[PDB]
Write a protein that binds this DNA or RNA. Structure first.
Ligand SMILES: [Mg+2]
Ligand SMILES: [Mg+2]
Ligand SMILES: [Mg+2]
Ligand SMILES: [Mg+2]
Ligand SMILES: [Mg+2]
Ligand SMILES: [Mg+2]
Ligand SMILES: [Mg+2]
Ligand SMILES: [Mg+2]
Lengths: 117, 151, 55, 56
RNA sequence: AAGGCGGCCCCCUGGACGAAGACUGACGCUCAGGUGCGAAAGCGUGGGGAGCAAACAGGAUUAGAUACCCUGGUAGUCCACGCCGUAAACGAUGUCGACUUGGAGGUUGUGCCCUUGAGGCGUGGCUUCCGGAGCUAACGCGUUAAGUCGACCGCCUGGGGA
């Protein structure tokens, strides 16, 4: 319906899940898919493979604009940091730049207590 | 196999064609040490497959085996309380063994009248890469490509 | 001798992301490590150096 | 750890670079460190212990 | 001094150390009673309130689960001015002084050397790890003593009861 050809893959990779969002340079959301909503729950949801099909499913709800180049923004420590990026590149995508944007406070907010499991 | 590595017994070749490979096959099909009756079923299946499917008996065998041969597989593994699935690239000798073994097993799990007819139709199906045995290779790969991340 | 205004020299002691490089890696004396970090900190406030690669 | 792929460099090599830039940068270590509150007494305890192990 | 003190800048201010020489002339050490300081939690009044989180509510686990885990969340954690005077407030080692073999480092002054190299030779303060004699029930301590001595203080006298 419209045209971009130049995008950015923001991947949010937490421990429990990994959300993939495709966007233009402006930061406007073009398409998105998550692992948790691609048929993966709990123990399987938090896997690199689930992040992979997330990246794959996302490349199908965006090529309506015919993106052809993009940059990658890796946020968080979970799986699908890396495997998500791979799936994008195999789905027919030229990777321009890779950047980690995981936030690091300069020691500000006190985090939750340690879990005594 | 904790300490002692080993070689492998190098069985005699198939009596009819002089093939070690088919000796690995008759043995795999063999049951209750009935060698005499095992090779009888393998040949009649090869004879059924050979006669009425373009001949080249050894080659016919390979066309079918070429199709059920698996390039990679997964090896279960238990690390930090987790049972991870590690996809391992599998070696040529066993590649044949799995290929042969799945063809034999799919043959007995079949509806036809005798093991020879079953064996023949399994080879034929495998030759056209279809049926149970080929499907066994594909599940192995679907299962492998899935855990590609941990190789 | 060290001055926060000498951003040329200061750059040798920060990472790609503007983080101060520890004395270990640089092998700089311990008295001056402090002097450097105070000049890098001063230079940051005055926007003569970035705090982070972000900006 | 910002990375920019150069021409006729495979996607893989650039990636391996990126992962080593983060290995170099200490991102995941850093995120692990902050997931949960650590008491001051505890991090002082950690600090002594590693000083000690750092004698061979 | 201990409690404890960590972004950057200024202002007010305490202590420590070095170099050189001048001045005072035993003015010193210790200290029952006394006075002051003293983490966190807690208390009172008024502010403040992002995150965290006693209490409390809900979801789970479990034979039970007034817990551990999850979703929330009040006091509190923050500021001012008062109170409290306690901790495994620990080096579980009172303060001061003199004396007694060594090795490797960290930190911080200062004298000397074609500064001719990021050094070469000395001389103070603090500090970490080994270790010698000696000490010690052993563990260990070992010139920062738990060694060899002296001055003064505090304290102990079987466990429970306390
Ligand atoms: Mg006189
Ligand atoms: Mg109050
Ligand atoms: Mg809670
Ligand atoms: Mg109250
Ligand atoms: Mg007491
Ligand atoms: Mg010792
Ligand atoms: Mg001794
Ligand atoms: Mg008594």
């Amino acid at each position: 319906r419209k045209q971009v050809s130049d995008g950015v893959a923001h991947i949010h990779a937490s421990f429990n899940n990994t959300i993939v969002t495709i966007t233009d340079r402006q930061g406007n959301a073009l398409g998105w898919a998550t692992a948790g909503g691609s048929g993966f729950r709990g123990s399987r949801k938090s896997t690199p493979f689930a992040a992979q099909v997330a990246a794959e499913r996302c490349a199908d709800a965006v090529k309506e604009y015919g993106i052809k180049n993009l940059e990658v923004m890796v946020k968080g420590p979970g799986p699908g940091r890396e495997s998500t990026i791979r799936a994008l590149n195999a789905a027919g995508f030229r990777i321009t730049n890779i950047t980690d944007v995981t936030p690091i406070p300069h020691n500000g907010c006190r985090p939750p207590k340690k879990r005594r499991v | 196999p904790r300490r002692r590595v080993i070689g492998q017994r190098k069985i005699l070749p198939d009596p009819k064609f002089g093939s070690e490979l088919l000796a690995k096959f008759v043995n795999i099909l063999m049951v209750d040490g009935k060698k005499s009756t095992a090779e009888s079923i393998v040949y009649s299946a090869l004879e059924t497959l050979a006669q009425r499917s373009g001949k080249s008996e050894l080659e016919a065998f390979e066309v079918a085996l070429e199709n059920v041969r698996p390039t990679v597989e997964v090896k279960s593994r238990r690390v930090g309380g987790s049972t991870y699935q590690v996809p391992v690239e599998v070696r040529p000798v066993r590649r044949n063994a799995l290929a042969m073994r799945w063809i034999v097993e799919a043959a007995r799990k079949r509806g036809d009248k005798s093991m020879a007819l079953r064996l023949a139709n399994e080879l034929s199906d495998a030759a056209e890469n279809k049926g149970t045995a080929v499907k066994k290779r594909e599940d192995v790969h679907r299962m492998a490509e899935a855990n590609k991340a941990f190789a | 001798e060290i001055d926060y205004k000498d951003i040329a020299t200061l750059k040798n002691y920060i990472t790609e992301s503007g983080k101060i490089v520890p004395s270990r890696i640089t092998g700089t004396r311990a008295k001056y490590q402090r002097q450097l970090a105070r000049a890098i900190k001063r230079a940051r406030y005055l926007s003569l150096l970035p705090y982070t690669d972000r900006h | 750890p910002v990375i920019k792929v150069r021409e006729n460099e495979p996607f893989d090599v650039a990636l391996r670079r990126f992962k080593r830039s983060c290995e170099k940068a200490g991102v995941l270590a850093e995120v692990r460190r902050r997931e949960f509150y650590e008491k001051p007494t505890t991090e002082r305890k950690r600090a002594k212990a590693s000083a000690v192990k750092r004698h061979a």
